[PDB]
From Swiss-Prot, chains A, B:
Gene name of the record: fabB
Quaternary state and interactors: Homodimer.
Active-site residues annotated for this sequence: 163, 298, 333
Stated induction or repression of this protein's expression: Mainly activated by FadR, but minor repression is also conferred by FabR.
SUPFAM superfamilies: Thiolase-like
Keyword hit for Acyltransferase: yes
Cited function: Involved in the type II fatty acid elongation cycle. Catalyzes the elongation of a wide range of acyl-ACP by the addition of two carbons from malonyl-ACP to an acyl acceptor. Can also use unsaturated fatty acids. Catalyzes a key reaction in unsaturated fatty acid (UFA) synthesis, the elongation of the cis-3-decenoyl-ACP produced by FabA. Has an absolute requirement for an ACP substrate as the acyl donor, and no activity is detected when both substrates are based on CoA.
Listed name of the protein: 3-oxoacyl-[acyl-carrier-protein] synthase 1
Compartments, as annotated in UniProt: Cytoplasm
GO BP: fatty acid biosynthetic process; monounsaturated fatty acid biosynthetic process
Disulfide bonds: none
Length: 406, 406
């Protein structure tokens, strides 16, 4: 029954360590992809990634960071930013039963799980493993490592759904507020970047391997010669809040979440059916009586995936399709963190009135003909935006956000 | 607004491969803990575990099982049982937008995450890794691997929260129905059992190590000489359904879910605060006009944990406490699968009118004095039952289930 808005955001990504840096990159169509000596040394074929350009050493208290893996660290930093951006003080959100946290990652921590196994097999056994691997490697690490130090008393758990992970976290947060159980819920996620995890993707042939010499051109959603996505890492968090509660404290409102769709393909384990995406987008548009001005597609730069989504978009919008752009062309695929980060990019476009470009399209794919895929930064007042997130196992999520009247 | 009931269940645990075996074990007070050569050979101090005594070979189609890890296998078999028990046919739950699945695991698959890293570092590299490690190792493996083959079209994702994982999955399923978004939601989870995961717990001193010579006595919740929990694996699944929809199809109803609590401690990373549990139980009891007849405790058999929960119980019920028993004394701690399996044990006690015994208590802990702890199988007509699930990161979940009027 309650209305839900976003009143704060935080982000650590391949194209910026805060929203100011991210805004700059989006407007310039700047790539965050670099060559990775780590991936190459591991024996992989894909040697490019969207890495976080930031030394996190000493940014978090020793007694707090000892339980964390990179996914949790990225999410933590993003939350600190979100709290400051939202203008919330400790006395308001801490030890408050009406304030919760829903954040997750797609793979937990392959790095620390492998570390533990490797240590256990050495001559020092248990002594070499140490007592902190469980909180670093458990699937709920991102929520557990944040809810505790931030003194959260409300809901506390992680939602995981591969590449749709953080989108579902935001959606579930919305639901908690609509149910009247929470007034504020920090929602987002994080994902570490390491060969331990990346090699499994390369092994299934999902990663780009043809552009290692020109890193910034590897991620090329919609380009006729795309050859897989570029793995990335990072984190993001947004403050989901009940409308009256936000207005009562004089919060800055970025937008209202007016639609949330969550569906399942029930078809293929790794490829989207398209049919599920159609139902997801429609579900998210139910009751939304303003046109979608911009759509931030899932578009990972894969042969099948890119066009399956475009086909879904055509069926949903008919001859009234919105401006479209795939920011992954610039940032790479941050997996579990993709949902929240892309929701954030969309919010920035909505807040500053511009559409970020879909870069690296040298030869548009035949199946993309006729659609308005923006390839250059465009100034334009936007009112309603949509963001898609699809994951392995046929899990779909769509979020629709709209400016609040006045 | 909608009322929610459980119309089917499935389970694969250390004390039974279906509800018939589980029921017999609960009544007899039979342990499912055995000696593990695998754990001993790995270099661990804890050599006992609650293993699934079932050969799963050929129980799942080749093309489907190739994408799964053990957690998914256990959950899959549990879902098959639940579907048959619920009396649902393919046309009833398949390709139906109103039917979903919410199931998870606490750690995904440490075994396959390590396999991938090991294979990659060998002479075959990517070829040895293979194309199936991602779906086996990703945190959402359990939901992805079930939703796809069972043709699920509704919600599809995993909730993870350490030892409260599958309890939150059931609670979220309840919310989806209350929101009127789904008519049926399969909820539960699974967890693999392997040294790759167990050694990290031993490394932090969380597992029992003093009773390897007498495996069946290692797990002893509330006993003065307990020394940590006994790790276990397995799966569970329940059919969460809207009341009218269930009645309309002549379904057998085990009970109605009349309360669901989800809170956070915001205190310690590994130990429960007690305060969070109090708030969680009170939240789940709100509006419930009948007394709690039986409480299936979290009780993992750890020095600190066991008494913190007892203190919370005492705070909530005072001198009028319900009958209490920790089934983990029999089954071991199945981590991510604990929530749903224990909900199932509780439903069986409600359905068959008996209280399972809290075994292995040779010297009751002094802090348990004055509480109604049951140590002998006791026939008694139950009407309302409660089950607690707490996890690392201070995450709490409580479910309250009650019989439906006549
Ligand atoms: C998006 O759907 C692509 C798949 C993301 C899965 C989450 C990350 C899993 C890492 C597992 C490492 C072996
Ligand atoms: C319950 O809270 C006890 C902790 C369970 C955490 C989930 C299982 C994580 C295993 C993988 C990391 C070692």
């Amino acid at each position: 029954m309650k209305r839900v808005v976003i009143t704060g955001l935080g982000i650590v990504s391949s194209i910026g360590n805060n929203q100011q840096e991210v805004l700059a990159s989006l407007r310039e169509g700047r790539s965050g992809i670099t060559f990775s000596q780590e991936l190459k040394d591991s024996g992989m074929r894909s040697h490019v990634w969207g890495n976080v350009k930031l030394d996190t050493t000493g940014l978090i208290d020793r007694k707090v960071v000892r339980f964390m893996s990179d996914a949790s660290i990225y999410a933590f930093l993003s939350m600190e930013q979100a709290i400051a951006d939202a203008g919330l003080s400790p006395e308001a959100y801490q030890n408050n039963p009406r304030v919760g946290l829903i954040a997750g990652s797609g793979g937990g921590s392959p790095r620390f799980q492998v570390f533990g196994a490797d240590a256990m097999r050495g001559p020092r056994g248990l002594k070499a493993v140490g007592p902190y691997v469980v909180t670093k490697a458990m699937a709920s690490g991102v929520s557990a490592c944040l809810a505790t130090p931030f003194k959260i008393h409300g809901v506390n758990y992680s939602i995981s759904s591969a590449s749709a992970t953080s989108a579902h976290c935001i959606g579930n947060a919305v639901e908690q507020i609509q149910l009247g159980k929470q007034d504020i819920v920090f929602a987002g996620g994080g994902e570490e970047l390491c060969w331990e995890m990346a090699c499994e993707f390369d092994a299934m042939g999902a990663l780009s391997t043809k552009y290692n010499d020109t890193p910034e051109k590897a991620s090329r959603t919609y380009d006729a010669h795309r050859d897989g996505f570029v793995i990335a890492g990072g984190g993001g968090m947004v403050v989901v809040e009940e409308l009256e509660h936000a207005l009562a404290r004089g919060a800055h409102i970025y937008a209202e979440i007016v639609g949330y769709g969550a569906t399942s393909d029930g078809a293929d384990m790794v490829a989207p059916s398209g049919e599920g995406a159609v139902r997801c987008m429609k579900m998210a548009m139910h009751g939304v009586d303003t046109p979608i001005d911009y759509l931030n597609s899932h578009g990972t730069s894969t042969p099948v995936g890119d066009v399956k989504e475009l086909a879904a978009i055509r069926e949903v919008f008919g001859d009234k399709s919105p401006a479209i752009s795939a920011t992954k062309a610039m940032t790479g695929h941050s997996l579990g963190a993709a949902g929240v980060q892309e929701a954030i990019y969309s919010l920035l476009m909505l807040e500053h009135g511009f559409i970020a470009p879909s870069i690296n399209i040298e030869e548009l794919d035949e199946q993309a003909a006729g659609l308005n895929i923006v390839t250059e930064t465009t100034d334009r007042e936007l009112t309603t935006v949509m963001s898609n997130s699809f994951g392995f196992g046929g899990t779909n999520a769509t979020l629709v956000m709209r400016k609040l009247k006045d």
